[PDB]
Amino acid sequence: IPEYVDWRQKGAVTPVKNQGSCGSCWAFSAVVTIEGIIKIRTGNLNEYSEQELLDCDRRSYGCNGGYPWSALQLVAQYGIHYRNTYPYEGVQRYCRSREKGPYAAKTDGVRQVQPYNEGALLYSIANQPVSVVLEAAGKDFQLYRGGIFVGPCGNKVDHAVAAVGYGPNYILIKNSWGTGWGENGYIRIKRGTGNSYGVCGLYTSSFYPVKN
Numbered sequence: 001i002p003e004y005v006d007w008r009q010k011g012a013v014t015p016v017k018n019q020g021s022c023g024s025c026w027a028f029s030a031v032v033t034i035e036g037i038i039k040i041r042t043g044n045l046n047e048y049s050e051q052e053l054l055d056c057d058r059r060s061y062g063c064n065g066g067y068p069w070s071a072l073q074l075v076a077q078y079g080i081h082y083r084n085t086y087p088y089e090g091v092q093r094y095c096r097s098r099e100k101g102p103y104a105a106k107t108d109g110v111r112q113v114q115p116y117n118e119g120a121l122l123y124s125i126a127n128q129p130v131s132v133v134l135e136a137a138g139k140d141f142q143l144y145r146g147g148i149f150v151g152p153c154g155n156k157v158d159h160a161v162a163a164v165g166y167g168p169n170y171i172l173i174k175n176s177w178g179t180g181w182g183e184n185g186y187i188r189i190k191r192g193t194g195n196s197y198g199v200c201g202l203y204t205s206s207f208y209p210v211k212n
Contacts, residue, residue: 001126006165012039016185018178020090022063027053028176029131030071032162036129037211047083062092068131072110079103113206116196133157134200155201
């Protein structure tokens with residue numbers, strides 16, 4: 001695997017989104033990975049619906065939070081429409097999938113990255129973007145304006161995000177707080193510190209879609 005990976009220089013990442021007030025980060029995170037794998041397999045970059053996971057994953061708690069792994073199973077069993085067909089509302093409605101016609105994409109399952117393992121995360125990112133969680137509740141995280149973020153933060157992971165690259169000293173994260181946060185919506189979190197949690201808990205639970 002190479003020293004730098006940035007899926008944006010491969011055209012596999014869509015613009016930065018803003019989830020709003022709704023605790024819909026789990027849905028945001030999942031759709032990053034799905035836009036990623038479908039580009040990698042088909043050579044096309046598409047935007048998919050966070051609002052359909054919001055409404056339709058039963059497992060997760062709508063605007064109160066939820067699970068990128070439940071969302072990514074829903075897309076493996078059923079599929080997902082495009083974003084322009086089932087646009088973001090930032091409120092949980094009921095599941096409208098059956099109304100919006102046949103799914104635009106379906107994936108073939110979901111895998112877990114082995115947790116607490118920087119190298120297994122780096123090797124997964126070198127393959128495609130990955131859904132990751134971290135502790136975002138801290139002020140230092142919220143106030144982040146750019147540079148390689150080192151904390152402070154703990155590991156009471158609370159927020160799902162997508163890892164779309166890495167370098168020698170960082171992992172490159174697409175967040176869902178719009179472009180005025182961070183580096184135009186992105187954060188570079190420090191890696192290689194030897195905290196098996198990863199900085200802010202980054203190594204706690206990572207999942208990626210499987211598409212043949």
